[PDB]
Design a protein around this ligand. Structure first.
Ligand SMILES: COc1cc(CNC(=O)Cc2cn(CCCC[C@@H]3C[C@@H]4Cc5nc6cc(Cl)ccc6c(N)c5[C@H](C3)C4)nn2)ccc1O
Ligand SMILES: COc1cc(CNC(=O)Cc2cn(CCCC[C@@H]3C[C@@H]4Cc5nc6cc(Cl)ccc6c(N)c5[C@H](C3)C4)nn2)ccc1O
Lengths: 527, 527
């Protein structure tokens, strides 16, 4: 029986067998008052004690969110859908502690991705237990609100200010600052790590003054705030709040009662009109994300990092290879999970309009041009791969590079990775390659588990990445220093060195897709 | 005393010492009635005998043309200005014969370049004597009308049909067909070769049915009809004839008397309003060139070669490296023959408007984009070199490639060269590099002459090129088969192999500037 006193009560945990060792987990500790009734759309309110024992013995409820049934019964998509009851009562977190309880352990905090419209800390791929077992860390993860009940914005209005999600994340960070010592954690060795919208969340934490003192280092997987999908400007933010109002019969004259109307609408007629608040969409449409609110983010994030007003510290950021491929089975003509998807050029041109609906007609022809440059017109596959690369480079790769590029030019240590192994177990077709999101099971160390159908090479790939990620957390260098493995250079402007990740050899390279990125970074911003 | 009977009289020549041998030259034989009085703007009329001896002992008059004094006293530009009296009486040609007089020699015919506005067969760099001496060929060269008295067009009107210049060239070809046997020539081994507008002339001979039976093979140096400057469409053709009419006080109602007015204007008030017939110009402005006339060219040349209605035969076509550089000292801001000409980007942007005056504003930004892609922003020279490459690739290189590319796809042997030696004697600044036009002295073999300040390496470069050019004429392969020198591949679509030309080694390469050319060839045609 293991039970530990927080600042607001005492909480009972569970003992887990992990690799012939044990790990303590406390699943579903509450950190913010349930954001219900009067309290939805507002910023999370801190707790009052219980006295009483909170049995942190089950994963709490996932926050309200839509669910992806494009493919019902297909593991490849349902593995990301929540595995808990949905409820606007969801501001809970989970900590995993090594056993015997450590004394001054580094803390790793996970923020899950989901285009800010979906997701939960409860997924099997986010199971922190292997990290605590193997590298004797404390893994923490929290649920933050999502979709419109996380990011609905009327700016300047505390009834619905925008960014209530990131604010949820940060009160979780606050809780770690005050409580983790109880658990044997060190509130001065705290490194965030997320993927996708989570990656974009942790990059936003770097710029938010409110979050400067609640962590030390940062890990960015497949996301950054400067990605085109990540921040919504105040004009669209309002154009989609006031929109959501029209399809829920809430359209009024006085902002301070649109909002009261919207909180008497039951949670779900909110969630299914969320998809329409925008005329044209893409598979990547973040209908309600971060905004510039003058609170969490005090103005346009691209400006403050270009001016360099951010936390100064080491960061670890990378991307996967075929990051664009996942999204083309959700719109693009000729694409299916159930064939090789050999598109013709005309289909490629209509693919581009879904992913760049407007955006001028020419803007598309120059995107087409820069990628159609066949090496050479032979190969039937090449339109197919071209449309994956455009979506991947535009939406993820080039931002990450251009993110870390300028984060280093202010003196900080940055390390960039490129993760090229496709899982032997990936349930998506081979043509999709090394998909967005399928770095994560390796980071969390699911293949270290030997009863699970990963290949032996993948267990050694995972053990390696787990150690680097580990060491970057404690000591700020992604070193694995003893089995003669590749040294990891610092990413600087000019040289721009990145380490690759796969089963075979781990190389050092420069210029991660420089030709492509500089189309997207230097010129497309004008069209 | 050497004197030989043509079909229209007998002509006396001269004996020249060339390299301790002798060569017979007959300079200034007339081949067409003087195109004067009633006869200007019309097609050249064939001769009636003289009986009488025509002493072909001096270079005849150059046809009327403007003269380039941008730089008076500068050898580099005046070496192209005529060296004979100007006169609309100018339809004369020159033949050089080996001694002892050959018996069935190959005939080489030279058509000089000049943007169709200038030029003459009398220049020292076109001195055919070394070719006849060294490789025992017969070199022939003719003067053809130029500027408006060569190419003024009102289409369908035999009083001024257009293309009277190429028609002059072709009656010269006719004369060779009927007379060259007298001189010891073989009217069935006849290969044309020109440079620049001359190159573009000989490519037009390939498409003209009237010229199919007057030659066998073709050499194309630094020009082809598909170049942007080479063919004028019937709308501008008329818009500049009727224009020329307004500035010479000839504007009338009845085409059949605009023309009679224009022939009572003395030759020179024609030539100096030639420059204004167009609102905006460039240094490359061909104010009166070839047109589609339905006689010499029976319709749009790009269509008939794309459909492949041309003479089927081997061709030899190439370009020089810094072909764009010569023209930027005639307009582009920041450029001078008397400094290193390090331009700034803004000057580069105004350079582009002179060379692409309109042409939309964006069209320019995408030209800028595709070339500004510094390797990297370091080097001060790079705007300067960029603007040379745009002019060279647009105007000469990419057309030649795209010309020969499709001439081969119909089964014919094509060989492509890339000439990279800059003359040790070039009077233009080093920054200009391997200039347009400065292949020719090597082809004619001026450095074979040893009293002349070329370097020893240039004499061996010239002897080599003279032999290839030679052998391509007789046997249709640009082979120099005995001193272990590089074999010359055939240029085909797909592989696209070209031989380079310089002092050091002669390499075989593929893909002559493929990235650039395919911007100009595939996409710019739309803007
Ligand atoms: C119409 O009802 C809705 C339904 C949904 C469900 N959403 C989707 O299917 C959107 C989607 C998500 N993905 C990723 C391929 C599968 C791996 C992961 C699945 C996850 C949902 C998601 N969305 C992202 C959006 C952006 Cl811009 C960037 C990354 C995303 C992402 N990583 C993920 C993941 C990983 C979780 N393809 N399409 C969202 C919003 C709705 O309004
Ligand atoms: C205003 O009076 C005029 C004066 C002129 C004199 N023209 C020029 O200076 C035009 C020019 C020509 N050149 C080439 C650099 C020197 C080497 C050669 C000089 C020759 C004139 C000429 N014009 C060409 C135009 C085109 Cl598109 C292509 C090639 C050309 C060319 N090879 C030459 C050469 C080579 C003979 N740079 N600018 C022409 C027309 C006029 O109306």
């Amino acid at each position: 029986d293991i039970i530990i006193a927080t600042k607001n009560g005492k909480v009972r945990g569970m003992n887990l067998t992990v690799f012939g060792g044990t790990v303590t987990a406390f699943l579903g500790i509450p950190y913010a008052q349930p954001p219900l009734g009067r309290l939805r759309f507002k910023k999370p309110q801190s707790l009052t004690k219980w006295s009483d024992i909170w049995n942190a013995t089950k994963y709490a409820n996932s926050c309200c969110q839509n669910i992806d049934q494009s493919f019902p019964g297909f593991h490849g998509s349902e593995m990301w859908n929540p595995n808990t009851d949905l409820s606007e009562d969801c501001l809970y977190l989970n900590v995993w502690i090594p056993a015997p309880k450590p004394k001054n352990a580094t803390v790793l905090i996970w923020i899950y991705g989901g285009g800010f419209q979906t997701g939960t800390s409860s997924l099997h791929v986010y199971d922190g237990k292997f990290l605590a077992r193997v590298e004797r860390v404390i893994v923490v993860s929290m649920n933050y609100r999502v979709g419109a009940l996380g990011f609905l914005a009327l700016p300047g209005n505390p009834e619905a200010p925008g960014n209530m999600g990131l604010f949820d994340q940060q009160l979780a960070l606050q809780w770690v600052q005050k409580n983790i010592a109880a658990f044997g954690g060190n509130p001065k060795s705290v490194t965030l790590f997320g993927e996708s919208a989570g990656a974009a969340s942790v990059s936003l934490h770097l710029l938010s003054p409110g979050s400067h003192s609640l962590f030390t280092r940062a890990i960015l997987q497949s996301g950054s705030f400067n990605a085109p999908w990540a921040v919504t400007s105040l004009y669209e933010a309002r154009n989609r709040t006031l929109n959501l109002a029209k399809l829920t019969g809430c359209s009024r004259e006085n902002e301070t009662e649109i909002i009261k109307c919207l909180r008497n609408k039951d949670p779900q007629e909110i969630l299914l009109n969320e998809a329409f608040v925008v005329p044209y969409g893409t598979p990547l449409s973040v209908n309600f994300g971060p905004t510039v609110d003058g609170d969490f983010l005090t103005d346009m994030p691209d400006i403050l990092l270009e001016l360099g007003q951010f936390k100064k510290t080491q960061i670890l950021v990378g991307v996967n290879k075929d990051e664009g491929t996942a999204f083309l089975v959700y719109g693009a003509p000729g694409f299916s999970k159930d064939n090789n998807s050999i598109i013709t050029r005309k289909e490629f041109q209509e693919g581009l309009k879904i992913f760049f609906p407007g955006v001028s007609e020419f803007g598309k022809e120059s995107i087409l041009f820069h990628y159609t440059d066949w090496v050479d017109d032979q190969r039937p596959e090449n339109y197919r791969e071209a449309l994956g690369d455009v979506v991947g480079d535009y939406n993820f790769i080039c931002p990450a590079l251009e993110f870390t590029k300028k984060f280093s030019e202010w003196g900080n240590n940055a390390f960039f990775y490129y993760f090229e192994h496709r899982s032997s177990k990936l349930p998506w077709p081979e043509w999709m390659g090394v998909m967005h999101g399928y770095e994560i099971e390796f980071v969390f160390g699911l293949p270290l588990e030997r009863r699970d159908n990963y290949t032996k090479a993948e267990e050694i790939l995972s053990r390696s990445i787990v150690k680097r990620w580990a060491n970057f957390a404690k000591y700020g260098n992604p070193n694995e220093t003893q089995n003669n493995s590749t040294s990891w250079p610092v990413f600087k402007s000019t040289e721009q060195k990145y380490l690759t990740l796969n089963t075979e050899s781990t190389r050092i390279m420069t210029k991660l897709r420089a030709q492509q990125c500089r189309f997207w970074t230097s010129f497309f911003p004008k069209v």
